Design a protein around this ligand. Structure first.
Ligand code: BLA
Ligand SMILES: *[C@@H]1O[C@H](CO)[C@@H](O[C@@H]2O[C@H](CO)[C@@H](O)[C@H](O)[C@H]2NC(C)=O)[C@H](O)[C@H]1NC(C)=O
Ligand SMILES: *[C@@H]1O[C@H](CO)[C@@H](O[C@@H]2O[C@H](CO)[C@@H](O)[C@H](O)[C@H]2NC(C)=O)[C@H](O)[C@H]1NC(C)=O
Ligand code: EIC
Ligand code: NAG
Ligand code: NAG
Ligand code: NAG
Ligand code: NAG
Ligand code: NAG
Ligand code: NAG
Ligand code: NAG
Ligand code: NAG
Ligand code: NAG
Ligand code: NAG
Ligand code: NAG
Ligand code: NAG
Ligand code: NAG
Lengths: 295, 658, 98, 49, 49, 49, 98, 30, 87
């Protein structure tokens, strides 16, 4: 049930467009530079520049999904953790949507925002020049359209400079993606504990089942094996209860991400401090390991 | 001359009546779709028990003979049906070369069992199973009409006999008079899941080893599975072989030096000797020496063989008849306080025997002494052979003083006195296990080492299952075993080659079963999550291909993309499409489209529509409550009194539910 | 209730009818501990599920005030498109918004 | 049973069949206005006529 | 007779009040809650009767 | 903390004072298991709240 | 326990035994009771082996006079004037089911 | 006369090989 | 006495049924010998991969080692932690 809920979380956050839009060849829309949030065709990766920067920062615990028997049968001299987890019966399953599909979804969302505006989310894709869309959004926040049209150029310069500042600040600062990395660490930590609790004898004569079966009779070994069985069953039950509690918090966060995608990327919000600090204009989504980043 | 058996060999496992249930059991059954040998007379072996079927119309197969050796030097049983009656007879028959139907036996003697029943195409089937000196016979009858072979079907077997025979049954042979045919199959220890109908009989049963679908059915405990993908047990490799390793020891242990010694010390001056480099074959003591007391602490006496010890010490002394009960952990008395003490956590064996002829003489044998006065008690495994005069205050004195005695007291042994005042020789053996290189070791037979596949291993008494690989660890001279973070035994030293071996389990990797539902079809696909099939798969397949998730067997790989029906993972989805079959594909993200961007044009709607959409949201769930006493104890008063001592669990539970 | 939990039988009457007092009090306590742990696991599962039900009911209550008693301007909060109005209907353990 | 509770027994004299069921059944709830208030209570037996 | 009782002890070790669990539904409620003062409401009780 | 969990006492000193190692390390194990279970239940309830 | 009589580990029953010296032991020596002390393995529970063939440690069929060829049954010698450890005892083992 | 030990007197607890391991024990130590 | 760290290995254990309550050294007729007493305490050890025991910490000298024993590691992050009792 937890794994099915995880797949549903990802699907509800990202798959919100009825149809996929091709990224335009021209990233320059009336002075606004969209080059760093859209995929580069000649570049081998199909993620953006900022998405590459975000994927480099989270030191993802490499989950394998192809760890053959000979790879764990070899390399014994380095006591790897994933080999021990898989030898003791603990398995990690791959997600339904790969990273490329999520990158495609976010590229379609940004391409729809740059061309159709606010109308594809609440209807059909209705194309419009970008400057007229920005004039409509200034009209939405309480400022007339001439304020955009008189000084469009320095507004575009400020937009480009702020994008450059974000790109610069994601190359040095480390703590910024702290809520995602912690999640990864937390999972790994719990799973590692599930191995070390196999060294407890739980009040029996030994922690190794073979020695108990090898130096005792039937009826005397029944008691010790029952004590070990009870201890390991309750250890596994504790692990499952902690996972069930953590998944509810993850689901609440995913619900908030879904409503933020629905009300800030596909529209303009008037709720105070729901999307940034100040009067909201628009937002852009970017993918990240087990998460999303809104600009 | 060989055929297959399908859903044959199911019998009632108990005398419990139950209905409308799916019971699950584990014991000796005949596996589904397994090989049977047909005969249209040899000496067929038994090995665990036999399923025996006979298609006949003229009653030509009648009875059997069971026995280890078919000579007259062993004990054998015949279960024969003559023309009018059924007779079971367990005796020492001299079995003739052709047991023709009467006169099967030439002579019978020295014999134990006889049972005689009351006076008495189609198929008769039996199951014979021998355990704990009991032979169980199950019988079923079916009116079939086919003739080349055994018809496939499901038929249950009922119990008729359990015979109390103490017989080695390793061979058996059928008895024929003079068409019909008889088939033989071998039982194996397996897990089955049965079904009980309203009347209480069994109508269906499923194995848990022939198929992944069967494994899933046994796991979920049902006979009907909905469409989906399910995680089953990990990939298992059965062991095939055996390795047994033991050191180079040839000579036997000094039983005669320790037990048949010329003289033993006193209990206050007991003597300790180290035992090393010998084979503990105690069965040679079954001819001369017999023990009144023999008790082992820490291990089982039956497990004294098959085991190999580390550091053996023997402590020898002499006590009297009723002091032998003081040589035990947690005892008090004159011997246990001031003479000889055993630790609380003692691993070893205490053994004692009566010596009245060699230690007790007429007019007394006052050579054995014991201490009865001391300032304080002894520590475990300590001795005190000092002899100074004792005074209760704690001051030195001289033995003609009034409060000054001699601390040692003489045992007085005579030839004519009761057993409580007779000499007894006591030997205490101390050892530890699974801690150190082993030098004194049990009697077994070794086996050459196999270094590639999963085998049962026995290294100096360490028994397990796994694979053996060459390693590169560096053991110190005093280290024999190595353990992991989870205290698995990862590495070992070979007692013969002195190379380092590394041990890892032979089961590894997760398995998933994809099914479109048992209602729809009975075909499945298997996903092996961490193998590269471009092997470590089991039995077979027709289509095999490598996804990003793993290896998929049993599905067709189409090129077109649809929406996802059953999510496999890593972008791969699967469904049941048209002769229908399981197909796998890459899932579709959405409908492809494009809109042109221009800086001087705009799209404006010219019409509208009214649309109503539904949305379903849960609000509440069911309110429940529990009676803690009724669930745990029921109507028992004793359980309720014992439950009162578990205070403040039921209140804390009812409060949460409320 | 049919598990042994390390005891000789799951039927408490057999243990109480064939064994001595002190030996029966050892076999009984394993069943008591097992059944307490089973019932504790059930209560923990119910407590976890009640939180999800409560969050869903909170959303259903806030969707009744902002869409049935008013007209919302939040995108896709009440249906797809521009929200005109909304009607509630009852359902077994739930609500259905049109 | 499914819960391994003995229900059916064959009487060893008459060779008839008998079924054992618990003699306790039903939920009982007590409604009180408060012990500081009067000492009268109401009793509700759940799911019986 | 063998029955179930609940007692009470003071700050001087003296017993002061006690209640049988099989005379009243109110007394059964008192034994189930394990208290002498009960607030207004409806409660589910045990079967000491 | 006043539950003996079916041991001879809820006090550890009495068990350690009138028994020896092999027998007294059985009762202490039952007490330890019961107290760990109670602490685990408390932490689970706090995590849910 | 190895070559004559074996009990199961999960044994339900009662073992009882009483001393019979006045009816089983004579001063000349009662040599009518035998026991097996040589065998090529251990018995299984509730099994019997009534066979008197010569025994050789290697395992080949043998002829009773030889280097290492023995008779497998020894004789109990029951005299009246001997200690309590060499006196006859009659043993009855009762096996149950419940 | 008087001196200071300063991390002296640590010996092997068992006869079991252990690699890449951290391990906590009570015993008679200096 | 140098203040370094060194590990000791087993050489032999002797089966002697003796109270040892006093001892004395035997010297030929400059060099020095130092005697210290053992006490029952708790230590936390750390092995090397191919080698020997390399690290060892007490739990009673200072509150910092008590913290190291409570967390059961040698590297501690910045912050405030609750420690057990080992003093
Ligand atoms: C070989 C050992 C043998 C056994 C174990 C045996 C048992 C046996 N056979 C029975 C029926 C019967 N026994 C026979 C005669 C036979 N003549 C033969 O050579 C054979 C093998 C049979 C069948 C067992 C017949 C014809 C029936 C009635 C089956 C029927 O017509 O329904 C019954 C009564 C059915 C019941 O109690 O449910 C028993 C107990 N009879 C035997 O002969
Ligand atoms: C039952 O009898 C058979 C027949 O002798 C026994 O089989 C022999 O077992 C010994 C011990 O392993 C072997 O040395 C012999 O070679 C076996 N005989 C043959 C012909 O191979 C069997 O062991 C007996 N069962 C028991 C439990 O004692
Ligand atoms: C080992 O020897 C010491 C010293 O002789 C013993 O200690 C004595 O114990 C008695 C017991 O009351 C005291 O009266 C003496 O005063 C102690 N001696 C000294 C010098 O203090 C010790 O008992 C012996 N070991 C054992 C296990 O008994
Ligand atoms: C009779 C007066 C004392 C009554 C109360 C006794 C309290 C102490 C309990 C048992 C001691 C009784 C004598 C035990 C003698 C042990 C003899 C032995 O094992 O060698
Ligand atoms: C947009 O930005 C990118 C990177 O900052 C830059 O290479 C590109 O020239 C810009 N486009 C313009 C200036 O038209
Ligand atoms: C039955 O015998 C055939 C012939 O060798 C063999 O291929 C088959 O595997 C056997 N059946 C089983 C279940 O082993
Ligand atoms: C049967 O046993 C007798 C001794 O009782 C023996 O003489 C005879 O040879 C045996 N039969 C066979 C066929 O060897
Ligand atoms: C069958 O055997 C029994 C027992 O020996 C005997 O009483 C009966 O007469 C026999 N019947 C025939 C036909 O031989
Ligand atoms: C077996 O028979 C022989 C002679 O035939 C006899 O000497 C011996 O005592 C008999 N043994 C048993 C156990 O009946
Ligand atoms: C078995 O159950 C069926 C129910 O369909 C019933 O009709 C039948 O009589 C039962 N058999 C017997 C022998 O009572
Ligand atoms: C057993 O003891 C007897 C007594 O003399 C002897 O003849 C026999 O050879 C012994 N058995 C063995 C195997 O040595
Ligand atoms: C033990 O026996 C083996 C048998 O091959 C031999 O190689 C080895 O040298 C012997 N000695 C030791 C000390 O292992
Ligand atoms: C599986 O083996 C093939 C063999 O050519 C190889 O190309 C492929 O990379 C392997 N799979 C993985 C995940 O490395
Ligand atoms: C809008 O569409 C409807 C069909 O649903 C049509 O009847 C109507 O005439 C259209 N309105 C206009 C202005 O074309
Ligand atoms: C005793 O039991 C028998 C069953 O064998 C039954 O027929 C009879 O009615 C019972 N009662 C009496 C008084 O015999
Ligand atoms: C008792 O109540 C139930 C449900 O309220 C009803 O079905 C039943 O008929 C009633 N009994 C009588 C005797 O009216
Ligand atoms: C392994 O041990 C050798 C000494 O035999 C040493 O030189 C080397 O540094 C060790 N390797 C590691 C990784 O500690």
């Amino acid at each position: 049930g937890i794994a099915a809920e995880q797949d549903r979380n990802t699907r509800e956050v990202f798959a919100q467009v009825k149809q996929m839009y091709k990224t335009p060849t021209l990233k320059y829309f009336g002075g606004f530079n969209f080059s760093q949030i859209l995929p580069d065709p000649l570049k081998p990766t199909k993620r953006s520049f900022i998405e590459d920067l975000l994927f480099n920062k989270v030191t993802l615990a490499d989950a394998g999904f192809m760890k053959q028997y000979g790879e764990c049968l070899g390399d014994i001299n380095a006591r790897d953790l994933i080999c021990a987890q898989k030898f003791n019966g603990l398995t990690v399953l791959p997600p339904l949507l790969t990273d490329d599909m999520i990158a495609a979804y976010t590229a379609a969302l940004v391409s729809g925002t740059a061309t159709a505006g606010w109308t594809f989310g609440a209807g059909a894709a209705l194309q419009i020049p970008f400057a007229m869309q920005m004039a409509y959004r200034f009209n939405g926040i309480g400022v007339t359209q001439n304020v955009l049209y008189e000084n469009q150029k320095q507004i575009a310069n400020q937009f480009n400079k702020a994008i450059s500042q974000i790109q610069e600040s994601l190359t040095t600062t480390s703590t910024a993606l702290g809520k995602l990395q912690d999640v990864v660490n937390q999972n790994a930590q719990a799973l590692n504990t599930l191995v070390k609790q196999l060294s407890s004898n739980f009040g029996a004569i030994s922690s190794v089942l073979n020695d108990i079966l090898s130096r005792l009779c039937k009826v005397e070994a029944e008691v010790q094996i029952d004590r070990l069985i009870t201890g390991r069953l309750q250890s596994l039950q504790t692990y499952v209860t902690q996972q069930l509690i953590r998944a509810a918090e993850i689901r609440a966060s995913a619900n908030l991400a879904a409503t933020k995608m629905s009300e800030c990327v596909l529209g303009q919000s008037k709720r105070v401090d729901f999307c940034g600090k100040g009067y909201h204009l628009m937002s852009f989504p970017q993918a990240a390991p087990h998460g999303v980043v809104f600009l | 001359t060989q055929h297959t058996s399908s859903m044959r060999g199911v019998y009632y496992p108990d005398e419990i009546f139950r209905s409308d249930t799916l019971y699950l059991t584990q014991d000796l059954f005949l596996p589904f779709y397994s090989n049977v040998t047909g005969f249209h007379n040899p000496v067929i072996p038994f090995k665990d028990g036999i399923y025996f079927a006979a298609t006949e119309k003229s009653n030509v197969v009648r009875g059997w003979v069971f026995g280890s050796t078919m000579n007259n030097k062993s004990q054998s049983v015949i279960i024969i049906n003559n023309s009018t009656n059924v007779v079971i007879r367990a005796c020492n028959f001299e079995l003739c070369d052709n047991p023709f139907f009467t006169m099967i036996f030439d002579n019978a003697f020295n014999c134990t069992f006889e049972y005689i029943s009351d006076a008495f195409k189609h198929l008769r089937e039996f199951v014979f199973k021998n355990k704990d000196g009991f032979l169980y016979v199950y019988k079923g009858y079916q009116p079939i009409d086919v003739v080349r072979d055994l018809p496939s079907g499901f038929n249950t077997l009922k119990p008729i006999f359990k015979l109390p025979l103490g017989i080695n049954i390793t061979n058996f042979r059928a008895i024929l008079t003079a068409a019909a045919a008889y088939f033989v199959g071998y039982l194996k220890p397996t897990t089955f899941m049965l079904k009980y109908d309203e009347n209480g009989t069994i109508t269906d049963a499923v194995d848990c080893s022939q198929n992944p679908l069967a494994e899933l059915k046994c796991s979920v405990k049902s006979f009907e599975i909905d469409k989906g993908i399910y995680q089953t047990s990990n990939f298992r490799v059965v062991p095939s072989g055996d390795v047994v390793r033991f050191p180079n020891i040839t000579n036997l242990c000094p039983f005669g030096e320790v037990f048949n010694a010329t003289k033993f010390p006193s209990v206050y001056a007991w003597e300790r000797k180290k035992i090393s480099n010998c084979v503990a074959d105690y069965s040679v003591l079954y001819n001369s020496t017999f023990f009144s007391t023999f008790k082992c602490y820490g291990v089982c006496a039956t497990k004294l063989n098959d085991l190999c010890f580390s550091n053996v010490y023997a402590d020898s002394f002499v006590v009297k008849g009723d002091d032998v009960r003081q040589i035990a952990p947690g005892q008090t008395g004159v011997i246990a306080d001031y003479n000889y003490k055993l630790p609380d956590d003692f691993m070893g064996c205490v053994l004692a025997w009566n010596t009245r002829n060699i230690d007790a003489t007429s007019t007394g044998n006052y050579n054995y002494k014991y201490r009865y006065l001391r300032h304080g008690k002894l520590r475990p495994f300590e001795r005190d052979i000092s002899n100074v005069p004792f005074s209760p205050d704690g001051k030195p004195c001289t033995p003609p003083a009034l409060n000054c005695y001699w601390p040692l007291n003489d045992y007085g042994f005579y030839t004519t006195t009761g057993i409580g005042y007779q000499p007894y020789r006591v030997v205490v053996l101390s050892f530890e296990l699974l801690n150190a290189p082993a030098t004194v070791c049990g009697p077994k037979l070794s086996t050459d080492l196999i270094k590639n596949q999963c085998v049962n291993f026995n290294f100096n008494g360490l028994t397990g299952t796994g694979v053996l690989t060459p390693s590169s660890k560096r053991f110190q001279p005093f280290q024999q075993f190595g353990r992991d973070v989870s205290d698995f035994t990862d590495s070992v030293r070979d007692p013969k080659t002195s190379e380092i071996l590394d041990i890892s389990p032979c089961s590894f990797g997760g398995v998933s079963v994809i099914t479109p539902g048992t209602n729809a079809s009975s075909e499945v696909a298997v996903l092996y999550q961490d193998v590269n099939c471009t092997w470590r798969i089991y039995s077979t397949g027709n289509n095999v291909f490598q996804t990003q998730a793993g290896c998929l067997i049993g599905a067709e790989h189409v090129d077109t993309s649809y929406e996802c029906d059953i999510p496999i993972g890593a972008g791969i989805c699967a469904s049941y499409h048209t002769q229908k079959s399981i197909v796998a594909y890459t899932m579709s993200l959405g409908a492809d489209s494009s809109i042109a961007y221009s800086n001087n044009t705009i799209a404006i709607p010219t019409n509208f529509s009214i649309s109503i959409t539904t949305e379903v949201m849960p609000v509440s769930m069911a309110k429940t409550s529990v009676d803690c006493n009724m669930y745990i104890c029921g109507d028992s008063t004793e359980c309720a009194n014992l439950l009162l001592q578990y205070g403040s669990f039921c209140t804390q539970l009812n409060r949460a539910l409320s």
